[PDB]
């Protein structure tokens, strides 16, 4: 018989379950099908946001993510060498996780966590909502629900899935979008690359004090990229460039100085990508993470972008199936997210520029400072070059300020409070982070007077939508939010903020949730 669920979610990749994670705290029915088994052959994801640990963090799994396995001890710099244990050209020292000076403007600093021990870890927090070796072969949508058709590659069995929307997080090759026909039109040049996966148990040993997190390789045009160790326990990844031939294990030999062992597990090619969907949704059809939006993995915006669309649309999904939200909240999800995801996506590119420009000067490699200090040469040119920032984006992870028809709108990035922006963080115990207060429904905090509050209490009342409100007391976060009165949505964005509480409060309401 029919399985009919309220929001089925087509994908079990970290952004199609990072929606199911939210969707969970918003006690809305969902269910999620994934055709492989769930396990990681080739680990693509290692870096988590800072903004997704945020989210991670109310999700209750970021804890889970830290201990996942990276060792605390393990460098997390950023060098650049002619070859892995040759000739060091420049390095950007960045701690180590139990060591680097705590964050600051937010409670929960950047993860690693490469994606084979991540998989799992969010399996479990979704727990029997999650179908695997489950495909969906074909859907159609009705007047108001969604029907889809999922093969039980286990069971053979076939059964059909009655629900109310369908987010498609089928990945960048997306074919959900193909069919609703939906472009997803290059910004960018798309490139060609190989992803060499192998073990090399003595080469951190090897290493000592060299150790780092990536080590980006200037040895030539193919060879000029990333090789980062996945879990710091001796599974590393060389990427490679093509250009229309040589061999697996060849290539890493080329790219290490030490002749330590080396087990070759896998050599997937790949293309970089940079495009965004024409739209975000299609009826009750949806596009979320790469299906919506996959730009380059340079400073890796990808899955955390993908993240933060989830949980964008996660809410207001929420909002419409609970019948608060406006009609024209759902169509918000793209008039929000789009412009995030390419003005992230550019961001991402332009890390990606800063490599395939660095030119490589023809004596780089050879011995002896008498064409040495040619290396001192590209290494300031780099410093220079601002590298840094493809490992520091607090603007793209906490930035983003969204300007929309449901947004009552007014250098270095720094935290804000004003409508479209995420409200900034601040410990009002030394547990408790204003962070903590968003994430169920909307939230007023209102930092002096509590002077008509009462009536904004009413407000919501009447239209059913979700309100808390909380009397803070200190002067030091009063003047991080500056304004009195402060609404941060259920997304944990500002969507008004004034000293003085609007007349119209009706209007207010009827324009937040999508209604006006
Ligand atoms: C080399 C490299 C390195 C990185 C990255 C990319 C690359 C190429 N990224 C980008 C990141 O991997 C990407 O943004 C996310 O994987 C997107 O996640 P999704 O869940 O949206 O889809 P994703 O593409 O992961 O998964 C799609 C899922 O849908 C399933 N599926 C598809 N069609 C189906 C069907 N018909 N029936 C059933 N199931 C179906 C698939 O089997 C799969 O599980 C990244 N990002 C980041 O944040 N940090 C990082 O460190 C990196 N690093
Ligand atoms: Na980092």
């Given at each position: 018989?029919?399985?009919?669920?309220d929001?089925?979610?087509?994908?079990?990749?970290p952004?199609?379950?990072?929606?199911?994670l939210?969707?969970?705290?918003?006690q809305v029915?969902?269910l999620?099908?994934?055709?492989?088994?769930?396990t990681?052959t080739?680990?693509r994801?290692?870096?988590?946001?800072?903004?997704?640990?945020?989210?991670?963090?109310?999700?209750?799994?970021?804890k889970?993510?830290?201990?996942?396995?990276?060792?605390?001890?393990?460098?997390?710099?950023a060098?650049?060498?002619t070859r892995?244990?040759?000739?060091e050209?420049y390095?950007?020292?960045?701690?180590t996780?139990?060591?680097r000076?705590?964050?600051?403007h937010?409670?929960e600093?950047?993860?690693?966590?490469?994606?084979?021990?991540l998989?799992?870890?969010?399996?479990?927090a979704?727990?029997?909502?999650?179908?695997?070796?489950?495909?969906?072969?074909?859907?159609?949508?009705?007047?108001?629900?969604?029907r889809?058709?999922?093969?039980?590659?286990?069971?053979?069995?076939?059964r059909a899935?009655?629900?109310?929307?369908?987010?498609?997080?089928d990945?960048?090759?997306?074919?959900?979008?193909?069919a609703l026909?939906?472009?997803?039109?290059?910004?960018?040049?798309?490139?060609?690359?190989?992803?060499?996966l192998?073990?090399?148990?003595?080469?951190?040993?090897?290493?000592?004090?060299?150790?780092?997190?990536?080590?980006?390789?200037?040895?030539?045009?193919?060879?000029?990229?990333?090789?980062?160790?996945?879990?710091?326990?001796?599974?590393?990844?060389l990427?490679?460039?093509?250009?229309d031939?040589?061999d697996?294990?060849?290539?890493?030999?080329r790219?290490?100085?030490?002749?330590?062992?080396?087990?070759?597990?896998?050599?997937?090619?790949?293309?970089?990508?940079?495009?965004?969907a024409?739209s975000?949704?299609?009826?009750?059809?949806?596009?979320?993470?790469?299906?919506?939006?996959?730009?380059?993995?340079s400073?890796?915006?990808?899955?955390?972008t993908?993240?933060?669309?989830?949980a964008?649309?996660?809410?207001?999904?929420?909002?419409?199936?609970?019948?608060?939200?406006?009609?024209?909240?759902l169509?918000?999800?793209?008039?929000?997210?789009?412009?995030?995801?390419?003005?992230?996506?550019?961001?991402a590119?332009?890390?990606?520029?800063?490599?395939m420009?660095?030119e490589?000067?023809p004596?780089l490699?050879?011995?002896?400072?008498?064409?040495?200090?040619?290396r001192?040469?590209?290494?300031?040119?780099?410093?220079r070059?601002?590298?840094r920032?493809?490992?520091?984006?607090?603007?793209?992870?906490?930035?983003?300020?969204?300007?929309s028809?449901?947004?009552?709108?007014?250098?270095?990035?720094?935290?804000s409070?004003?409508?479209?922006?995420?409200?900034?963080?601040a410990?009002?115990?030394?547990?408790?982070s204003?962070?903590?207060l968003?994430?169920?429904?909307?939230?007023?905090?209102?930092?002096?007077?509590?002077?008509?509050?009462?009536?904004?209490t009413?407000?919501?009342?009447?239209?059913h939508?979700?309100?808390?409100?909380?009397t803070?007391?200190?002067?030091e976060?009063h003047?991080?939010?500056e304004?009195?009165?402060?609404?941060?949505?259920?997304?944990?964005?500002?969507?008004?903020?004034?000293?003085?509480?609007?007349a119209?409060?009706?209007?207010?309401?009827?324009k937040?949730?999508?209604?006006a």
């Open positions: 018989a029919p399985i009919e669920t929001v089925l979610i087509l994908g079990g990749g952004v199609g379950m990072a929606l199911a939210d969707l969970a705290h918003r029915g969902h999620v099908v994934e055709q492989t088994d769930g990681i080739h680990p994801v290692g870096t988590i946001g800072p903004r997704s640990m945020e989210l991670f963090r109310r999700w209750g799994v970021a889970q993510i830290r201990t996942a396995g990276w060792p605390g001890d393990h460098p997390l710099d060098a650049w060498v892995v244990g040759g000739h050209v390095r950007i020292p960045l701690g996780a139990d060591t000076a705590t964050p600051e937010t409670p600093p950047d993860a690693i966590c490469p994606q084979h021990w998989a799992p870890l969010l399996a479990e979704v727990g029997e909502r999650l179908r695997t070796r489950s495909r969906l072969d074909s859907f159609e949508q009705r007047d108001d629900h969604v889809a058709t999922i093969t039980d590659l286990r069971t053979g069995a076939t899935v009655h629900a109310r929307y369908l987010v498609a997080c990945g960048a090759s997306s074919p959900t979008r193909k026909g939906i472009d997803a039109p290059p910004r960018h040049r798309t490139q060609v690359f190989r992803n060499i192998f073990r090399a148990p003595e080469l951190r040993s090897l290493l000592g004090e060299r150790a780092a997190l990536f080590f980006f390789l200037m040895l030539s045009s193919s060879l000029r990229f990333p090789l980062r160790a996945l879990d710091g326990r001796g599974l590393y990844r990427t490679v460039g093509v250009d031939t040589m697996s294990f060849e290539l890493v030999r790219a290490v100085a030490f002749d330590t062992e080396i087990e070759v597990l896998s050599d997937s090619e790949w293309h970089l990508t940079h495009r965004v024409d975000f949704s299609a009826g009750r059809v949806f596009l979320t993470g790469d299906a919506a939006h996959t730009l380059s993995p400073g890796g915006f990808g899955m955390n993908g993240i933060g669309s989830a964008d649309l996660g809410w207001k999904l929420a909002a419409t199936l609970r019948g608060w939200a406006g009609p024209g909240l169509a918000t999800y793209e008039e929000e997210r789009r412009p995030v995801a390419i003005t992230s996506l550019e961001e590119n332009v890390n990606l520029r800063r490599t420009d660095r490589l000067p004596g490699h050879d011995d002896g400072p008498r064409g040495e200090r040619i001192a040469a590209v290494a300031e040119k780099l410093e070059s601002g590298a920032r493809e490992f520091d984006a607090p603007g793209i992870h906490f930035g983003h300020t969204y300007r028809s449901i947004v009552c709108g007014e250098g270095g990035w720094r935290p409070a004003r409508p479209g922006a995420r409200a900034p963080h410990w009002l115990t030394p547990t408790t204003t962070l903590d968003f994430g169920r429904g909307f939230v007023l905090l209102s930092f002096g007077t509590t002077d008509g509050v009462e009536a904004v009413r407000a919501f009342a009447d239209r939508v979700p309100l808390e409100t909380v803070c007391h200190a002067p976060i003047a991080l939010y304004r009195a009165h402060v609404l941060v949505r259920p997304d944990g964005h500002v969507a008004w903020r004034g000293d003085h509480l609007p119209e409060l009706g209007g207010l309401v009827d937040v949730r999508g209604a």
